[PDB]
Amino acid sequence: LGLREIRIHLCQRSPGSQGVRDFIEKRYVELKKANPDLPILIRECSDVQPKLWARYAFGQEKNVSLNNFSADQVTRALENVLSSKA
Amino acid sequence: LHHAVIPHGKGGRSSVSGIVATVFGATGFLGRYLVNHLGRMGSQVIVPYRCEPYDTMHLRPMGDLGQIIFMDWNGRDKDSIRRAVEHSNVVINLVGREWETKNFDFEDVFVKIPQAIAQVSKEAGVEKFIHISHLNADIKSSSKYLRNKAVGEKEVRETFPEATIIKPADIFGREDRFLNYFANIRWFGGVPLISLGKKTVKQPVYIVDVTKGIINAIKDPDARGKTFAFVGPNRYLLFDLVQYVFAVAHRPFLPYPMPHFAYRWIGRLFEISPFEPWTTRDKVERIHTTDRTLPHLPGLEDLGVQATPLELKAIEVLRRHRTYRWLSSEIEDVQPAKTV
Amino acid sequence: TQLITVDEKLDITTLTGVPEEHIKTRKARIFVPARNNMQSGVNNTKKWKMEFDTRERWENPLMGWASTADPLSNLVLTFSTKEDAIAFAEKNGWSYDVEERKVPKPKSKSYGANFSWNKRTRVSTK
Amino acid sequence: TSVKPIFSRDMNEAKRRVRELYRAWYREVPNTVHLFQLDISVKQGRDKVREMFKKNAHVTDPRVVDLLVIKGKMELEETINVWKQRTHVMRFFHETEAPRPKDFLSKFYVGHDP
Amino acid sequence: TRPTVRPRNDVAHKQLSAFGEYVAEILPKYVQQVQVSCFSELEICIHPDGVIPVLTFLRDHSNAQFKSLADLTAVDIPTRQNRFEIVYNLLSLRFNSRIRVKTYTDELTPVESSVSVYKAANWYEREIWDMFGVFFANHPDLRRILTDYGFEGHPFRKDFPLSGYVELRYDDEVKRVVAEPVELAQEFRKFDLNSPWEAFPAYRQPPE
Amino acid sequence: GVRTSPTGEKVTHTGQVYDDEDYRRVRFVGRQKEVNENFAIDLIAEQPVSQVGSRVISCDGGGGALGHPRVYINLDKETKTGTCGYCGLQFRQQH
Amino acid sequence: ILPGAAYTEKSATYVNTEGRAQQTKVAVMPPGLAREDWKIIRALSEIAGMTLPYDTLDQVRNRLEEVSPNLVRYDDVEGANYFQQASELSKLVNQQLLADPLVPPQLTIKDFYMTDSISRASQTMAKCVKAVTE
């Protein structure tokens, strides 16, 4: 039906989260003004790989890998999430 | 629900089941295995006994400490019943006599005592009552047993509106009077029947199936007020049933027809002693009574019990009667009896 | 040569006679036992301990004792290092969790600080 | 990783020994039903022996299956020589035990067990 | 120290130290450590490949003559990777003495049977099969001797609980004494008795 | 000093008596609940307060080596008597 | 009413005020017929035809790691960075401060001993309140 929440997991000190860090350091705020009613939960953890969880209606949760991605690639994956609504 | 009767544990011997049972007639055949099966859940079982305490001794290893409480009772005594059932939450009635005595006919055992127990269990606040009637119990039968037991069925149903009435068809076991009766007419003269016993049809039900049915009747709140008919999975004629009895025990077998001219008079010829009777005329009229089929009643399939047939337990029953020359035999030696 | 090569996982869960119910449903806990704060001694906080999860303890209806159904309830094993305890828990297949040794920080106690000039750490009495 | 073997060099001889032990039990079961005068059948006994062999089916360690062969030989010697009784053979057929919960909902209903 | 303290036997300590050096310098292939206790007893800690070649020395050598096997013992210690500590106790009637030979194994390594040296161990290590699970190869009748016949497990391992996993009760249904999972009427109340103050300073283990 | 429940059952000195709907009175049907009837809390109230003239009194329960271990009781509280920790006796500085 | 478990009565992941996840252990079992809370919710999901994909507590913890992976790493503080983006998002809604003073409702010693569902049901806390208000 439609997207309900987004979960962006990342590390603090891994280089594999670096471009994922580059999504939040420059591109998060104007995203949040664009989606003010959409909870995008950012979770930092110890040594996890970056991960994207998209929860839809009736409990469906898409599972997108985000390791070794630049900020352009994270942005393209997240706008695919925002445009799919599957 | 009260805090001491909350079920705890992993369902073993020292667990708590949440069942406080008063098992009348517990010192017989069904009460033996019923106290055996209730005591392994940790149920506080009140056993009212009329007989010698020594005859109740085999009920003592069936539970934990304080999980079986023995007490005296009389059948014509309202005080003993009210003294025994006031703390329970299920009252099972297994009181029966296969033969009438000087002090008790079938009317005392099947009409007076079950109505007294059901009346007291209503007027003392017992949530579950369970009565045990016979499957062939009818108002106009030719036997005193089935007539008094159908009248007691109707009375227990109408004076306690949620009494779980259970109809076991014909129970066989170790201390029974069904296979032990068919095997202990061997040296009397040749296993008498009427028209060679091919005119009456039985389905024997196994006693562990009946006991698990009573357990699942205690457990199930859906099983309140029903009238269950416990039957075995295989129906047999009497003739090939007695073929299978004398073929598991490896015995000689020469049956003969003994007609109605003199096979009701062998009662008063063969209970001239005042002791425990071998046969009687009611036993003659019940062995030669077919098992009626009542498909509308719920059975062992409708309480989650797989009914175990005759052939898997008849060797367990009838190993006792082999002399010596085929005690080292098997179950894979005798061909199973013909069903109908 | 009289020596065979075994690179498989060292597992004896079929040799200790333990039923399956007390292997895949029990949570072994490896921990340095914390000091009892009633007391000041730390000799009990020297060796690692492996305990297990507590199953149900109910009231016996005869007396009021704590009846139980768990055989491994009273089992507390003693180990010296964390690696021996982890290798033992992976030897018998028990699903385990490991707490760490939390030694106290070495305190900077100074008796002159009880009688300072300008510090707040003076005592109001002695 | 170089430890001393028990009887088998690798998995092949260990499978041979497990196989001969299963041969011995397959030969044994009718005698055990006969002389102990049990109430079970040879089909039921041999399927229970199949269940007892398949209970340990996940082991790839040769020393462990060697010790399982040896303990099966101990069970076999306690069964041929009449040292087990009727009860020690019928302890495998857990008949007096009530049927235990398997799914989540009944284990939720009866107690706190995971 | 006069009424209550035990008198120290320096003669036994010096003689057992000399005999420990003797057994050490004869057998450097298997003898790992040699220790003498403070109450004058000798312990020859060896390797499990030297079960037969050490004992056959002590059974036969003219200055050992340990002809008697007093007691064979296994001690399970869970924190070691070789968890079982098999203990031989030998009595020499001519030299009026005792020696202790201590070997080790885990659950899977077999220890060589010493029935060829001392037939007395024909039950003892057999008991160590039953009580611990240490396998003794080249043993004639190696089977369980103290537990029941339908006993699965090994009791004196310390991961085996105090009460077992089965209880026996008679059951009138199958007319038989059957085994069911144990439910104790009173739990075995474990007492945490270890006081946290160091009782013996001379036995202190130095830290990490 | 035993009193009686409304169910029909005696009361211990602890304070235990079963409910009306608790099934564990069925162990007393046909038998008797053996309770003690010499309640210690009602027998220690009959002891008069020992009027002594010291500040610290030494109580051992009498008998010497047959009583409780000997303790010392301060009696400077005049509002409250000095109750012995073991034996339940109590003392009073009379001034 | 569905009776639940306490904090001494379940293995249970809590979080303190600094983001450190911790777990309890079962001291006693829950009294009566009361079950553990997620067991109850999972049984309700089984009855309602919406069966959740777990049976055991470790699978609940794997689900918890899917939702936020810092809740399976016990006794570890993770430093939450990025104050600047939250600061920039706080500049949007210029909410007006009231003139009413910031007065917390826990002013005295009376307001401490009875706060939550356990401390109101204690006779010891009742003695503490009766002792500090006399």
Ligand SMILES: NC(=O)C1=CN([C@@H]2O[C@H](COP(=O)(O)OP(=O)(O)OC[C@H]3O[C@@H](n4cnc5c(N)ncnc54)[C@H](OP(=O)(O)O)[C@@H]3O)[C@@H](O)[C@H]2O)C=CC1
């Ligand atoms: N044919 C069958 O087996 C079937 C039987 N039933 C019914 O199931 C019940 C149980 O059968 P079963 O176990 O085989 O019978 P039993 O003869 O083996 O046992 C009956 C018990 O009832 C007691 N009892 C009977 N009458 C009195 C009395 N007047 N006063 C005191 N105690 C009495 C007996 O105790 P005591 O020794 O003190 O007299 C005995 O313990 C019976 O009601 C029977 O009709 C149902 C279906 C099939």
Ligand SMILES: [Zn+2]
């Ligand atoms: Zn005193």
